[PDB]
Amino acid sequence: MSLCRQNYHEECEAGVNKQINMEFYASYVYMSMASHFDRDDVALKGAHEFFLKSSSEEREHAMRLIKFQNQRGGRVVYQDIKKPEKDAWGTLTDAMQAALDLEKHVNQALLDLHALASKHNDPQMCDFIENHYLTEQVEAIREISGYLTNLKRCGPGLGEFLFDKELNS
Amino acid sequence: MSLCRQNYHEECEAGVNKQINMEFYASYVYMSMASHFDRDDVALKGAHEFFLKSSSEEREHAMRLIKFQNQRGGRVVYQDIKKPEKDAWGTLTDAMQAALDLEKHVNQALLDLHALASKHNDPQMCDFIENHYLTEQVEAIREISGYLTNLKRCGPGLGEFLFDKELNS
Amino acid sequence: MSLCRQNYHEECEAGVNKQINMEFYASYVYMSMASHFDRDDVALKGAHEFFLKSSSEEREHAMRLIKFQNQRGGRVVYQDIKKPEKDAWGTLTDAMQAALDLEKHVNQALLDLHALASKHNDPQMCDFIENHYLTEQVEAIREISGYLTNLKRCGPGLGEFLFDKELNS
Amino acid sequence: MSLCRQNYHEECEAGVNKQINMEFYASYVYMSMASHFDRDDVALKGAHEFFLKSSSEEREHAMRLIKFQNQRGGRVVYQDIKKPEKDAWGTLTDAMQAALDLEKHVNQALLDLHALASKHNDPQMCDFIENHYLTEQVEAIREISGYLTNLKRCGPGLGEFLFDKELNS
Ligand SMILES: [Ag+]
Ligand SMILES: [Ag+]
Ligand SMILES: [Ag+]
Ligand SMILES: [Ag+]
Ligand SMILES: [Ag+]
Ligand SMILES: [Ag+]
Ligand SMILES: [Ag+]
Ligand SMILES: [Ag+]
Ligand SMILES: [Ag+]
Ligand SMILES: [Ag+]
Ligand SMILES: [Ag+]
Ligand SMILES: [Ag+]
Ligand SMILES: [Ag+]
Ligand SMILES: [Ag+]
Ligand SMILES: [Ag+]
Ligand SMILES: [Ag+]
């Protein structure tokens, strides 16, 4: 009766908790991509920066869902952040493909989370997700898709090096 | 045929009119809380300011729904703004509890209003409500909930005085 | 022969990988402490901010070890970031105690890592750790210890609320 | 009894003298690399600038060890700065490989010098070396290693030309 929870279904709460984990996970994947591209034998500084920034943004995404959980009076429950699937992510194209797949996985998760909120008639949650995640995911996915297109266009070797400069700066 | 109304159902219009009254009412409650806390024998200036600001914001909420009504080509119809339930709101905790209850009542009303708009497939109204009210209500409720938590933590007497300073400044 | 690795023992590399995980873990603990203190029923904003900042700094610590790993030509290998031990961290004192314990655990780990580097005659690694971690840990631990002292001094209730204001601002 | 020497072993002094020569030598190598890349028939201005800067920095490294020698009350003793091993350093990759080898040779020398100081319990010398040389060497080596990686990635011809632009600016 002194708590803030209102119109916030347990499934949604749990879906937010899952999404928190997912965003941390994606953060972690990108951290790993970043460090891969900062290997002396890979040495793609643009990719490194790009994936670091993506890692940091994923962390922010997580945190904003954490906040949301608290703002709705849910209870954040953390789970392990699983290690990413690979220790080495290949070429920039390989990693961008993996990133695209991750973002699509995150995006589906968010869409599922939105479907949850819509199912439970939580329009504030829906709005939150739309406002902070959905278009962002769309943008990210489109952006990575274009990267893949240009990576392919640029080709291996020099093209990769030059394309890599074009990430960020 | 020269009017702007389009896709704006009479129930929604009426729901906006009810919500207008509700926001004015909440404004009025907060006005009363404010004046209570500015009694010489209550004299909690932070609460006074906080509730005045909440009153003014509720008024703005009302006005924005008035505007919306007109922008959608509905017709604003005012009702009495009922006096608040109490003339004296007790301690800061008591008033914060009452505020929490009011905000939850407003919030449910808004959620009902959004459900109305969703039922009548008025996505512009839905968006309006989400954009201007829902998250705001969530924020308000969470904020007041935290106040209650801290009021309890701080305890009566000195704690109330000190907590009161922490509202606003 | 085109790689940068020099004087960087496999044990050290592995110790850095462990330390990376540990810093991420500590980051994660602090994230959880932060969100605990942002519960509507806990609502200690200073603690929230303090633990968020500690989480972010732990992340930076991790990242700097990631960087170091790459700068020394080791290979970062991530592991799961385990969920923290608790879902709810108690009072600010309880959490500060837990933080103190975590920082001491991190600190011992770092000291072990430094002992590793010293054992393997990796003075650059030693210096790195001393330059970026050791004094920082000392500072953190002392700082948290003082917090605990003041939390105790301040007492539960009002004291906790007031002490909480004194974290950060 | 009016001199400053204290806790500065003759071997260390001699090791500093050797290191001075080594840094001058490395300076000289880089000078030669620089001039190679400024040949009209080589004409890689980025490499030229990069190696000039590396030459100048190596000179500064030498000078700082000279200073250190004097600050510790040792006696600087110069030896011939031997001419570099090659008159022509090949492609940018070839020279970067040679640079990597030189920096690793310098780095080992410094590590040996640090081991000397540690053996003789000269922590000020150890610190000096750690503070001014070790991490710098690590950085240099990693940097050159990445260059080699990117030179390889970029390939001969156009890639070399483009990679060359990416040194410095
Ligand atoms: Ag819900
Ligand atoms: Ag990384
Ligand atoms: Ag992203
Ligand atoms: Ag919306
Ligand atoms: Ag919407
Ligand atoms: Ag309608
Ligand atoms: Ag008033
Ligand atoms: Ag309000
Ligand atoms: Ag080592
Ligand atoms: Ag948090
Ligand atoms: Ag810390
Ligand atoms: Ag000595
Ligand atoms: Ag020259
Ligand atoms: Ag150098
Ligand atoms: Ag040191
Ligand atoms: Ag040291």
Author numbering:
A (entry chain A), B (entry chain A), C (entry chain A), D (entry chain A): 1 to 169
From the paper:
For the soaking method, DzFer crystals grown from condition I were soaked for 1 min in the condition I solution supplemented with 20% glycerol and 100 mM AgNO3. On the basis of the X-ray crystallographic analysis, the refined structure of Ag+-DzFer showed that a total of 88 Ag+ ions were bound to the DzFer nanocage through metal-coordination bonds. The fold of one subunit in Ag+-DzFer was composed of an antiparallel four-helix bundle together with a tiny helix E located at the end of the DE loop, where five Ag+-binding sites were observed near the helix A, the BC loop, and the CD loop. Notably, the ferroxidase site was assigned one Ag+ ion because putting the Fe3+ here could produce a prominent negative Fo–Fc electron density map. In the Ag+ cocrystal structure of DzFer, two Ag+-binding sites (Ag1 and Ag2) were observed inside the three-fold channel, whereas the other three Ag+-binding sites (Ag3, Ag4, and Ag5) were observed at the outer surface groove of the Ag+-DzFer shell through metal-coordination bonds. Ag1 was ligated by the carboxylate groups of Glu130 residues at distances of 2.7 Å and three water molecules at distances of 2.3 Å. Ag2 was coordinated with the carboxylate groups of the Asp127 (at distances of 3.2 Å) and Glu130 (at distances of 2.9 Å) residues and three water molecules (at distances of 3.3 Å). In the Ag+-DzFer structure, although few studies regarding ferritin with structural data to support this, we observed an argentophilic interaction between Ag1 and Ag2 (the Ag-Ag distance of 2.5 Å), and they coordinated with the negatively charged residues Asp127 and Glu130 at the three-fold channel. Ag4 was ligated by the thiolate group of the Cys12 residue at a distance of 3.1 Å, the carboxylate group of the Asp122 residue at a distance of 2.7 Å, and one water molecule at a distance of 2.7 Å. At the site of Ag5, the Ag+ ion was coordinated with the thioether group of Met31 at a distance of 3.2 Å, the hydroxyl group of Ser35 at a distance of 3.8 Å, and one water molecule at a distance of 2.7 Å.
In the present study, we prepared a marine invertebrate ferritin from Dendrorhynchus zhejiangensis (DzFer) and found that it could withstand extreme pH fluctuation. The majority of ferritins consist of 24 subunits assembled in a highly symmetric manner. They compose a spherical protein shell around a central cavity into which a ferric oxyhydroxide mineral core can be formed. As is well known, these subunits are reversibly assembled into a hollow nanocage with a diameter of ~12 nm and a 4-3-2 symmetrical architecture, resulting in six four-fold, eight three-fold and twelve two-fold channels.
